[PDB]
Design a protein around this ligand. Structure first.
Ligand SMILES: *[C@@H]1O[C@H](CO)[C@@H](O[C@@H]2O[C@H](CO)[C@@H](O[C@@H]3O[C@H](CO[C@H]4O[C@H](CO)[C@@H](O)[C@H](O)[C@@H]4O)[C@@H](O)[C@H](O)[C@@H]3O)[C@H](O)[C@H]2NC(C)=O)[C@H](O)[C@H]1NC(C)=O
Ligand SMILES: *[C@@H]1O[C@H](CO)[C@@H](O[C@@H]2O[C@H](CO)[C@@H](O[C@@H]3O[C@H](CO[C@H]4O[C@H](CO)[C@@H](O)[C@H](O)[C@@H]4O)[C@@H](O)[C@H](O)[C@@H]3O)[C@H](O)[C@H]2NC(C)=O)[C@H](O)[C@H]1NC(C)=O
Ligand SMILES: *[C@@H]1O[C@H](CO)[C@@H](O[C@@H]2O[C@H](CO)[C@@H](O)[C@H](O)[C@H]2NC(C)=O)[C@H](O)[C@H]1NC(C)=O
Ligand SMILES: *[C@@H]1O[C@H](CO)[C@@H](O[C@@H]2O[C@H](CO)[C@@H](O)[C@H](O)[C@H]2NC(C)=O)[C@H](O)[C@H]1NC(C)=O
Lengths: 331, 331
């Protein structure tokens, strides 16, 4: 139990008049620490690099405590010895040199700062006082504590084999839109080198909904474009996967936040002039407008951007019928 | 007078019973010719290489004649001598060695054929028996007669200096359309190397009527083409001069004998499809057609050839409005 000396608990009275210092009894033995006691009323606070213990003794000579932990110890319990008498009790339990753990427990090191030895140059464990409970999918090496004033080196976590996967800790990352990414040395809590997960080939017919250019495609119909594109969700209530990388600027036209409402399949979209003098084809299908009032000339028309022409040529004239900011198609 | 022996005329009776032969008395003297007489009734025909004389003597011993000329003689008269008596009369006068003459008189050479010596390789005087009265603008050299049986060489025409121009004989040629051409060694009768006469520069505004592609331009308006073109007449009742050489095939379109009537300025023309799949612009202005019956859509239209488009773009659509074999322009 990482203890060596028999534990004797003084009374509340002996605790007060006597001097107390924090100690570290292991297999090697007791290590003295520079402790300063504080007692005015019914409160006794011993402050140490390792921890801060508050002694509240209002009982019939009995004493109780609580501990604020500055640094977790390894393979040695943090006890309190009475100076000049054998009364030695043990307050803090301590923890082993935990090794080979994915999602390690948060181990504090206050006395000084941690030194990391990342094999494979993982650059995963951030430096400083604390070792967070960051999920560690793949990592190898040793993390050690240190303190300049007293050279105490404590091994918190050594990984020999890389345990890549944990049940509650994938090697994947999910964005806020459930966008599936793959982490080379990271998890959901902290992910190194995320690379989107590509959708499996030949399962495009299976996919239901896609997302692209700030617009959520409904039912994956995009008649003016090659199926599929963007981030696509297979089934429902599942994450999205990367399919086809297409720019949101087909020439000098931008999808979203635009002057001109049109259609990419069923989904209603807005389109705006990126380049004023860019001559390219509209990236969406047009909206029809019935102008047959009071047969006569019946045409259908759609609003269009400057120098931008929808793909449909007028049948009657075999030519792109445009005048002003409108395109027409006669019956 | 190219004669040497005193002229004595026999009676009609002496002429008949006696033998007669043709002679050539010059400065050198008399040359005998192989003559054969013919006498049945009142007709005496002496046949010679030089000439054929018919003697008709029904008078009181008087005799008269006429002469068919086979070969003109030079510097010696052709007389008839009576064989065995001194009676020698002279029938044909003869002609000198004419030289330096533009439009020389027609000189016959029957006995043989002419040999030409064209200096400057004119190739103007055609070979053979006759020397026509071809107008000779520029020529130098000698033309001589010859006869194989009897070697008589007679100089008909020697040119020393080239007399290029005669009052009734220009060095120009006029076509049936009064198309002015210029002859290097020819006249209107016979023209060598004709080269059209170009119209003087800067007198294009002055010219009235032009001719091009089987169509006579009236008043030299050709609005779809650069003024002027073809053969143009300055003033009136004057010849035409060569201005601008333009093909009658602007792409795959032919002026004249065509399906489609149109206009090159004021003149009405016909146009036909040279190349079925040639894509070029019409070479004429279109004809308008009022289709405003029972406001409404009013358009004007002109018939056009396959893949041929008139220059006028429709104003309303800024595009070449074509459907079938018709082009339209809306008001
Ligand atoms: C949309 O894209 C356009 C094309 O990229 C942007 O403007 C054009 O940009 C190109 C190159 O980026 C320029 O090309 C240069 O042209 C000059 C000659 O320019 C001048 O002369 C021409 C002919 O008269 C005239 O059209 C121009 O307006 C200039 O007056 C060359 O010397 C260079 O080497 C190079 O080839 C274009 O000139 C430029 N202008 C035009 C009208 O295309 C445009 O700015 C973009 N729009 C936005 C909002 O960014
Ligand atoms: C009017 O002019 C036209 C163009 O001069 C005449 O027909 C065309 O003539 C050109 C050359 O004289 C040919 O060019 C050759 O093309 C072949 C390839 O030909 C084949 O493949 C193409 C593409 O599919 C297809 O369009 C053709 O019809 C052929 O099936 C090359 O291998 C040669 O090296 C050369 O480049 C054209 O192919 C030919 N045809 C067409 C449709 O343009 C036409 O005949 C003229 N009209 C009259 C009445 O004379
Ligand atoms: C990190 O890199 C090493 C290679 O540099 C990977 O494999 C190790 O290779 C060395 C040299 O042969 C062996 O001694 C180690 O035992 C190997 N590690 C094993 C087998 O786990 C190693 O797999 C890499 N780690 C990660 C997480 O990618
Ligand atoms: C024909 O060609 C000659 C040149 O080969 C032209 O000029 C003659 O030149 C020779 C050589 O100097 C002179 O001896 C002649 O007297 C020149 N002829 C003249 C002066 O008439 C000649 O002009 C040409 N003729 C034509 C009709 O073009």
């Amino acid at each position: 139990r990482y203890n060596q000396v028999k534990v004797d608990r003084p009374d509340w009275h002996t605790l007060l008049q006597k001097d107390l210092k924090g100690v570290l009894s292991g297999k090697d033995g007791l290590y003295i620490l520079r402790s300063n006691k504080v007692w005015t009323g019914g409160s006794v606070i011993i402050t140490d690099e390792f921890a801060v213990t508050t002694f509240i003794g209002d009982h019939t000579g009995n004493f109780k405590f609580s501990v604020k932990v500055m640094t977790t110890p390894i393979e040695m319990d943090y006890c309190i010895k009475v100076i000049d008498t054998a009364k030695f009790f043990c307050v803090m339990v301590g923890t082993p040199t935990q090794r080979d753990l994915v999602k390690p427990p948060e181990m504090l090191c206050g006395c000084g700062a941690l030194e990391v030895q990342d094999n494979n140059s993982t650059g995963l464990i951030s430096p400083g006082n604390v070792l967070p409970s960051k999920c560690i999918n793949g990592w190898t090496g040793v993390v050690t504590c240190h303190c300049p004033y007293t050279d105490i080196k404590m091994k918190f976590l050594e990984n020999t084999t890389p345990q890549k996967y944990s049940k509650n800790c994938p090697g994947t990352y999910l964005s806020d839109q459930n966008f599936h990414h793959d982490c080379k040395y990271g998890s959901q809590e902290s992910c190194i080198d995320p690379e989107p997960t590509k959708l499996p080939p030949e399962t495009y017919e299976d996919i239901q909904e896609c997302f692209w250019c700030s617009y959520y495609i409904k039912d994956a119909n995009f008649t003016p474009h090659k199926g599929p594109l963007g981030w696509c969700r297979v089934g429902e209530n599942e994450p999205y996967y990367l399919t086809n990388r297409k720019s949101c600027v087909q020439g000098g036209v931008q999808i979203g936040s635009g002057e001109v409402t049109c259609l990419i399949g069923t989904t209603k979209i807005k389109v705006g002039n990126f380049n004023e003098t860019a001559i390219s084809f509209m990236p969406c299908n047009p909206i029809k407008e019935a102008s047959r009032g009071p047969t006569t000339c019946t045409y259908k028309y759609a609003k269009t951007l400057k120098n931008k022409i929808y793909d449909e040529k007028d049948r009657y004239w075999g030519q792109y019928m445009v005048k002003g900011e409108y395109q027409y198609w006669f019956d």
